[PDB]
Design a protein around this nucleic acid. Structure first.
Ligand code: CL
Ligand code: CL
Ligand code: CL
Ligand code: CL
Ligand code: MN
Ligand code: MN
Ligand code: MN
Ligand code: MN
Ligand code: MN
Ligand code: MN
Ligand code: MN
Ligand code: MN
Lengths: 97, 107, 93, 78, 104, 91, 83, 97
DNA sequence: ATCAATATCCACCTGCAGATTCTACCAAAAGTGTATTTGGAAACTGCTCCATCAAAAGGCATGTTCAGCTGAATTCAGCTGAACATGCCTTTTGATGGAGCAGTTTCCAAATACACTTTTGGTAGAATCTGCAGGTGGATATTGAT
DNA sequence: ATCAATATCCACCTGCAGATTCTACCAAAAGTGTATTTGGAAACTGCTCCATCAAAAGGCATGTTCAGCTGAATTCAGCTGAACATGCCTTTTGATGGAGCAGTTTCCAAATACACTTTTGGTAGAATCTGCAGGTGGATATTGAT
């Protein structure tokens, strides 16, 4: 039967998700996490559905942003594989830590 | 007899000056009676919190007079003040001593 | 001309916390920038809050929320206590 | 819940960010980061809600919160 | 006859922008006769510039309506717009880029 | 509830009469216009206060523009602003 | 008067080394000294440009420390110690 | 003839300058550089002496900060020597480039 | 690079439905005109403080030599993460109610603005105090060679 | 392992630049009395928001297998650190003209503040149409194999 090499599909996926703009986290889980975090600050809240969507957009744009700097950090260490140390370096240099 | 607003609120920091500055900034149409009081109290508490730690830094270097170096040591060594002033430069403050472990000679 | 400053108030507060301890003018410069910086961050946030809620008046309540948005956790809590305290004391004449 | 943010979803996010090969430890690291991000935005947003004496977090609450955090978002009221 | 926008030859609403500036400053601050005009003009210009670039982006994809993606393409692809508008464009996506050392 | 859509749409028609704009895209343009306005108004406010003034004049708007826009954008923005005031004060 | 030229080279290799030491750097490749100059000039160009815009707006001919403080604040490099 | 090993004196220097607070760039050369840059933006400017010192404090703090971040990029590539590519990675991630 | 199979893609059309556009009416802006104000611009000018000059000295910058050990290259294998086909269940979707609750009005009590008219705290220098910078010398590491 | 060779403390000492006090006007805080908003409290809407429910649909979890990537190991040319000689130019210390900030006045041009009168942009239902998402059939790219 048939089998693509490791990396082939990866690059395929990069091209596909860099082309499109649809949110990449599933809405219900995300909405569920938002409400959970929110509950620790103020009990019994409602959310405008636009507020949940605004959060998910800001959040996906942030993580996508972060994976870009993360990738630059892995490349800097002559790697093609991102690791937690790469994320930590990017977040450190960004002033988020 | 004239009794100062700072005194009525139990504060060192100038409640009247802070009210005047709140009006001068045209931050809004009106300023409530309690806004300058509350704001004076916050600023005074933050000042106290920083002089407390800077004062302690001075003592550790065996000095009587607080300098910007002590103010820096006090800010950067405190996690919440460091975050509050995380994008501020303290002139003549220097940095915290900090040498990454991989740079130390390998005994 | 007259150039106002927070220096004598900073100096009072210093004596309360460290009666034995002085402060150089350069350090006082920095404490002064600090107090203006924070005043401005708080007044700024308060002003925005008021405008967002169509309110013409900045009250202790706006200052308080601004303090909670601006200060990182433990400093927020204590600043709120001190501010609240000073308002309740002030308003009991 | 935070595990509701799944490996393939995190995988897609990294793909959009141009990442080709992902260490297995990334998925957990990403969820911790994601959690701190939401905690910070949501706290600020709830603070705006509560200031407005409302029980409903609005899009503008979030927008103001993102703006405060220097993550200005366009398309939801500012 | 005649609106302030019209006097100044702008599509953007000088009357409104004055009202907003008046709200920012208070009844204790003041706004000049023309500050509203000038501000209105600046806002219209930058709007035209973004619409011009996003409109090209949508024509180059042979599409009638400007969407968020076209706004992201136009903004991020222009060095001056990119530096001015560091905001997140909802539904914008990213510009396709794959680092050299990752290609087969 | 006020918006800038009407005005954005008029400007769209000048620069691209054939082109339309989707709803979500209009949302971005609205955010854009409110953002730039606050930035400029804010800088202009600070300028006046830095100089112990209480009036935001077109002069503050201009320096604000020079401080906020990156180069070519500022040059052209400044020109459009002066052109608009010039026309306005002629009448 | 007198022509100003090449003063970037006033930022010497030992001054750069010193700055790198305070930043905790132990070893410095040969090309760092010219990168650093480039990076310094850009930073300074940007602060001065803003500082002088504040100065012109106030119809002054003299750049004040406040002009610089306001410029640094503008660019998110807030500076305490100079008013 | 005694001779410290390479790196002993660099470590000593780190400890020395991390302990002090004095400006590390010479003052007159820095002032000429301010005057030169400013003159190319606008002729016949004067400077308050405190404005030149504010600039020098700012630049030095900026540069020390950059070198801290540069140093972490070098360490990340399993180096101890900082290189132009470490600076550029740091400035890219900081959003300066 | 080609011989051949396996899947991705990429065109060019195409038809539907979710969004758009257009079209039809009512209040808060927005514009006109008077009258009243006032913030900041013009006009000296007092007087900081900025530029410039000089001149003597030593702290540092420059340029050199030398080799320690670093960065870069190369090689290898254990093993980590990609690919996949399998088998299932959680998210999506789409009204439907129900209700909680944001968002309006209607009083007016409380609060804030404003306008004078006294009082006093804070400021600008003059006058007094005193921490510590800077210089030196032995005690205590710290380092690097045999 | 010891030691030599330097670096680095650490404490003791003391005049001076710089901090802490002491005075003397005054701007601005505080006290009143009057006029003006404000933005809370109750009594109620019309949404949107939560909560089911209820299909089928996708998308996720799962385990296997192995390509190829990461790190560990080993080499070595030569970059960069340490030390040194030499001497330049920065630093320090004053002094001086005079630019130009800046401190008080002065009166309009430019501002607010009404009382007006029109008109506009927000809104809630009508009147298409862009382009999504499919379905072809054609190369293309990808991977195993003389
Ligand atoms: Cl890691
Ligand atoms: Cl209040
Ligand atoms: Cl004007
Ligand atoms: Cl490099
Ligand atoms: Mn609920
Ligand atoms: Mn020049
Ligand atoms: Mn006046
Ligand atoms: Mn090595
Ligand atoms: Mn193998
Ligand atoms: Mn007194
Ligand atoms: Mn000493
Ligand atoms: Mn399509």
């Amino acid at each position: 039967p048939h089998r693509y090499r490791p990396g082939t599909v990866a690059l395929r996926e990069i091209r596909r998700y860099q082309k499109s703009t649809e949110l990449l986290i599933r809405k219900l889980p995300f909405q569920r996490l938002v409400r959970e975090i929110a509950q620790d600050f103020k009990t019994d809240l409602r959310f405008q559905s636009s507020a949940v969507m605004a959060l998910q957009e800001a959040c996906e744009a942030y993580l996508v942003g972060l994976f870009e700097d993360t990738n630059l950090c892995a490349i800097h260490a002559k790697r093609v594989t991102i690791m937690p140390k790469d994320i930590q370096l990017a977040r450190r240099i960004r002033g988020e830590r | 007899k004239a009794k100062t607003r700072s005194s009525r609120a139990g504060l060192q920091f100038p409640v009247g000056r802070v009210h005047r500055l709140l009006r001068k900034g045209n931050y809004s149409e009106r300023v409530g009676a309690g806004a300058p009081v509350y704001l004076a109290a916050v600023l005074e508490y933050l000042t106290a919190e920083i002089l407390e730690l800077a004062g302690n830094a001075a003592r550790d270097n065996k000095k009587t007079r607080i300098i910007p170096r002590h103010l820096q040591l006090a800010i950067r060594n405190d996690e919440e003040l460091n975050k509050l002033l995380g994008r501020v430069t303290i002139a003549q403050g220097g940095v915290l001593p900090n040498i990454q472990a991989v740079l130390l000679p390998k005994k | 001309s007259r150039k106002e400053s927070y220096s004598i108030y900073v100096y009072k507060v210093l004596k309360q916390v460290h009666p034995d301890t002085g402060i150089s003018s350069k350090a006082m410069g920095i404490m002064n920038s600090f107090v203006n910086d924070i005043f401005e961050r708080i007044a700024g946030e308060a002003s925005r809050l008021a405008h967002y809620n169509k309110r013409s008046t900045i009250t202790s309540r706006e200052i308080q929320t601004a303090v909670r948005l601006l200060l990182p956790g433990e400093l927020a809590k204590h600043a709120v206590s001190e501010g609240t305290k000073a308002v309740t004391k002030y308003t009991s004449a | 819940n935070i595990q509701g943010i799944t490996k393939p979803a995190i995988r897609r996010l990294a793909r959009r960010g141009g990442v080709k090969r992902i260490s297995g430890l990334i998925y957990e690291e990403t969820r911790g980061v994601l959690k701190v991000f939401l905690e910070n935005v949501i706290r600020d947003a709830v603070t705006y809600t509560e200031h407005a004496k409302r029980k409903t977090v609005t899009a503008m609450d979030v927008v103001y919160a993102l703006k405060r955090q220097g993550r200005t978002l366009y398309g939801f009221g500012g | 006859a005649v609106s302030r926008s019209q006097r100044a030859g702008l599509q953007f609403p000088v009357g409104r922008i004055h009202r907003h500036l008046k709200s920012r400053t208070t009844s204790h601050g003041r706004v000049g006769a023309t500050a509203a005009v000038y501000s209105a003009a600046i806002l219209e210009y930058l709007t035209a510039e973004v619409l011009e670039l996003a409109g090209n982006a949508s024509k180059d994809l042979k599409v009638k309506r400007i969407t968020p993606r076209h706004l992201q393409l136009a903004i991020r692809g222009d060095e001056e717009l990119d530096s001015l508008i560091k905001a997140t464009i909802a539904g914008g996506g990213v510009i396709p880029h794959i680092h050299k050392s990752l290609i087969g």
